[PDB]
From a paper:
We recently showed that the ability of PqsE to interact with RhlR can be weakened by the introduction of an “inhibitor mimetic” mutation in which the glutamate residue at position 182 is altered to tryptophan [PqsE(E182W)].24 The PqsE(E182W) variant is a stable protein that, while harboring all of the catalytic residues, nonetheless displays less than 10% of wildtype catalytic activity, as if an inhibitor is bound in the active site. To understand, at an atomic level, what conformational changes the E182W alteration induced in PqsE to affect its ability to interact with RhlR, we determined the structure of PqsE(E182W). Although the PqsE(E182W) crystals grow in the same P3221 crystal form as WT PqsE, there is a significant structural rearrangement in the active site. In WT PqsE, the sidechain of E182 lies at the edge of the ligand binding site and makes hydrogen bonds with R191 and Q272. These interactions do not occur in PqsE(E182W), and rather, new interactions are made between the sidechain of the introduced W182 residue and F276, L277, and P278. The E182W change induces the rearrangement of the G270-L281 loop between helices 6 and 7, with a portion of that loop becoming disordered. Examination of electron density within the active site indicated a surprising consequence—with the sidechain of E280 relocating by 12 Å and becoming Fe bound in the center of the active site. Indeed, the repositioned E280 sidechain directly binds both Fe atoms, acting as a bridging ligand, and thus is most likely responsible for the stabilizing effect the E182W alteration has on PqsE, which we have reported previously. The crystal structure of PqsE(E182W) revealed that a loop rearrangement inserts the E280 residue into the active site to coordinate both of the iron atoms at this site.
Numbering used by the authors: 0 to 272, 275 to 297
Write the structure that this text describes.
C-alpha cells in the first residue's frame, strides 16, 4: 500500500530496513563512516540481519549505536549475537530495559522465547553475556546526538511494557514508536492494542505522543514504515482502537462472556489461525484482556 513501506532495503535517503519486515532492524546512515541500528529483533534472524547489514556497511566497526525500545524478546534478541561483530557499537536503552538484561529470570524468558523460533537446522552465533552488552542507559527526555544530521529524543512511553521508550527525530518528523501504539493490522488498516502492562499508562503515553509535532514517518516495532495520514493520525488512531477494545470487553463481559471466551474470539477475528506478531497469541491476548478488565 502507498502509505506503508514494508519491503527490505532502502526506505529513505538515510534509512534502510534489514531482515524480516515482521521483526525488522532499521539502519540509519549517520555519516560517511558512521551508522546506527534501531530495534533489536529476534535471535534466529542474526545471520539474515548480518547479511543484510553487510550489503550496506562495508566496515562493521562503523556501526556506533543500537537503539532499543523495550525488553521484550522480539526487540532485543539479536544483541548477544551481533554485538560481538560490532566492536564499536553502543547499545542505548532505558534504565529499566538495561535492568532486564542483568536479571537472571528475565534473560531466561527472553532466551526461551527466542529459542522457540529457531528452525531445527540453524545454530546461533557465538554470543556474549547479556550482562556484558556494551550498554549506555538513556533517560526520559534525553537528546541522542547520533551524528551531524541525526538528533533523536528519548520519550518514555510505558504501558505496553513498564520499560518502553520511543525515539523521535524532530528534524524528520520521524517516530520510532516500538509497540506503544500496538500492532498495525495491514489487513484492516487499523491498530490492534498491545496492552501487556498498564492500560492507564498506555493511554497516557498515546496522549503525550499526539502532542508531538505532526508526524511524517511512523515506524513501529513490526510491519515497516508508515507515512502520510497513517503517520499523522497514528497515535490518535491507536488511542481510539484501545478504547474501542475496552468497550467491547465491557460489553461482552456484561453479557456473561468469560475472558477466555473473548480471548479466543479476538485471537480468531484478528487472524491468529504467522499472521499476528509473535507476541500476540492466545495467552498474551488473555493477559491484555485481564489488564483491561481490572482497570475498568
Ligand atoms: Fe512488545
Ligand atoms: Fe513486539
Amino acid at each position: 500500500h502507498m502509505l506503508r513501506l514494508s519491503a527490505p532495503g532502502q526506505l529513505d535517503d538515510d534509512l534502510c530496513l534489514l531482515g524480516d519486515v515482521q521483526v525488522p532492524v532499521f539502519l540509519l546512515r549517520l555519516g560517511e563512516a558512521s551508522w546506527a541500528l534501531v530495534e533489536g529483533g529476534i535471535s534466529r534472524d542474526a545471520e539474515l540481519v548480518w547479511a543484510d547489514l553487510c550489503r550496506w556497511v562495508a566496515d562493521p566497526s562503523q556501526v556506533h549505536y543500537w537503539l532499543i525500545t523495550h525488553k521484550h524478546y522480539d526487540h532485543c534478541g539479536l544483541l548477544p549475537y551481533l554485538c560481538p561483530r560490532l566492536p564499536n557499537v553502543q547499545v542505548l536503552a532505558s534504565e529499566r530495559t538495561c535492568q532486564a538484561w542483568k536479571s537472571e529470570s528475565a534473560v531466561r524468558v527472553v532466551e526461551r522465547l527466542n529459542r522457540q523460533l529457531l528452525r531445527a537446522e540453524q545454530r546461533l552465533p557465538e554470543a556474549c553475556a547479556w550482562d556484558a552488552l556494551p550498554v549506555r542507559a538513556v533517560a526520559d527526555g534525553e537528546w541522542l546526538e547520533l551524528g551531524p544530521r541525526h538528533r533523536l529524543q528519548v520519550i518514555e512511553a510505558h504501558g505496553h511494557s513498564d520499560d518502553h521508550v520511543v525515539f523521535y527525530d524532530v528534524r524528520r518528523r520521524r517516530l520510532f514508536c516500538g509497540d506503544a501504539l500496538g500492532w498495525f493490522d495491514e489487513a484492516e488498516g487499523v491498530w490492534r492494542p498491545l496492552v501487556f502492562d498498564d492500560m492507564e499508562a498506555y493511554l497516557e503515553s498515546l496522549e503525550r505522543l499526539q502532542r508531538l509535532p505532526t508526524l511524517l514517518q511512523l515506524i513501529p516495532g513490526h510491519g515497516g514504515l508508515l507515512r502520510g495520514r497513517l503517520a499523522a493520525d497514528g497515535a490518535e488512531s491507536a488511542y481510539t482502537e484501545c478504547l474501542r477494545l475496552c468497550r467491547r470487553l465491557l460489553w461482552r463481559q456484561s453479557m456473561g462472556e468469560s475472558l477466555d471466551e473473548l480471548s479466543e474470539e479476538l485471537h480468531r477475528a484478528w487472524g491468529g489461525q504467522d499472521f499476528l506478531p509473535g507476541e500476540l497469541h492466545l495467552g498474551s491476548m488473555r493477559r491484555m484482556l485481564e489488564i483491561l478488565s481490572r482497570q475498568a
